[PDB]
Design an enzyme around this catalytic site. Structure first.
Site, PDB file in Angstrom:
ATOM      1  N   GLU A  69      23.797 -66.637-101.825  1.00  0.00           N
ATOM      2  CA  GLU A  69      24.312 -66.376-100.438  1.00  0.00           C
ATOM      3  C   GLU A  69      23.789 -65.089 -99.835  1.00  0.00           C
ATOM      4  OE1 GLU A  69      25.874 -68.015 -97.915  1.00  0.00           O
ATOM      5  OE2 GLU A  69      27.178 -69.552 -98.794  1.00  0.00           O
ATOM      6  N   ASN A 112      26.300 -66.895 -87.574  1.00  0.00           N
ATOM      7  CA  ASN A 112      26.496 -68.308 -87.774  1.00  0.00           C
ATOM      8  C   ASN A 112      26.193 -68.917 -86.461  1.00  0.00           C
ATOM      9  OD1 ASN A 112      28.016 -68.975 -90.522  1.00  0.00           O
ATOM     10  ND2 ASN A 112      29.371 -67.433 -89.577  1.00  0.00           N
ATOM     11  N   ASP A 165      27.449 -71.378 -85.015  1.00  0.00           N
ATOM     12  CA  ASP A 165      28.569 -71.887 -84.235  1.00  0.00           C
ATOM     13  C   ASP A 165      29.264 -70.736 -83.503  1.00  0.00           C
ATOM     14  OD1 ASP A 165      29.346 -70.767 -86.546  1.00  0.00           O
ATOM     15  OD2 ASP A 165      31.408 -71.558 -86.323  1.00  0.00           O
ATOM     16  N   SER A 225      30.281 -67.560 -84.972  1.00  0.00           N
ATOM     17  CA  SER A 225      31.037 -66.629 -85.840  1.00  0.00           C
ATOM     18  C   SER A 225      30.024 -65.928 -86.737  1.00  0.00           C
ATOM     19  CB  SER A 225      32.069 -67.381 -86.671  1.00  0.00           C
ATOM     20  OG  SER A 225      31.408 -68.006 -87.755  1.00  0.00           O
ATOM     21  N   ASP A 264      28.800 -64.300 -90.902  1.00  0.00           N
ATOM     22  CA  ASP A 264      28.912 -64.172 -92.371  1.00  0.00           C
ATOM     23  C   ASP A 264      28.877 -62.741 -92.840  1.00  0.00           C
ATOM     24  OD1 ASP A 264      28.906 -66.883 -92.714  1.00  0.00           O
ATOM     25  OD2 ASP A 264      26.955 -66.980 -93.759  1.00  0.00           O
ATOM     26  N   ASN A 301      32.769 -66.069 -94.369  1.00  0.00           N
ATOM     27  CA  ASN A 301      32.690 -66.434 -92.978  1.00  0.00           C
ATOM     28  C   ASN A 301      33.869 -65.964 -92.197  1.00  0.00           C
ATOM     29  OD1 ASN A 301      32.182 -67.401 -90.560  1.00  0.00           O
ATOM     30  ND2 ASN A 301      32.482 -69.572 -91.037  1.00  0.00           N
TER      31      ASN A 301
END
EC number: 3.2.1.17
Length: 129
Positions: free
Chosen positions: A35, A46, A48, A50, A52, A59
């Protein structure tokens, strides 16, 4: 803080992730390496809308408050930048809680298809715990 192979996992066991929810520590090593690749300061946009945060790429969409997210839930009840600290216990402490929904390490994309189906011990071989 640049985490070594031998450095990060040693902490996660002390960090109380060792076999946590039956997930072997090698998963926890491997997942971190997939990750953020042992980068604690790692943050990513992100798509969408938002972000990380944390070495565990937690998230902010509903876990934490990054101050840029409408409809963020903050279940872990921590600021997002506490995930970016040189102390593992913040990121780990909410990663426990992420499995604490019982919805698995299936929250992490990297373990999900790239860290499963392999030798698990292979991260913790040659290191002392």
């Amino acid at each position: 803080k640049v985490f070594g192979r031998c450095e990060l996992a040693a902490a996660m066991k002390r960090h109380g992730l060792d076999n946590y929810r039956g997930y072997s520590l090698g998963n926890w090593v491997c997942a971190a390496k997939f990750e953020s690749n042992f980068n604690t300061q790692a943050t990513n946009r992100n798509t969408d809308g938002s972000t990380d945060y944390g070495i565990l790429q937690i998230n902010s969409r509903w876990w934490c408050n990054d101050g840029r997210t409408p409809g963020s839930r903050n279940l872990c009840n921590i600021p997002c930048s506490a995930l970016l600290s040189s102390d593992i216990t913040a990121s780990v402490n909410c990663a426990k809680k992420i499995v604490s929904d019982g919805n698995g390490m299936n929250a992490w994309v990297a373990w999900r298809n790239r860290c499963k189906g392999t030798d698990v011990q292979a991260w913790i071989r040659g290191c002392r715990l």
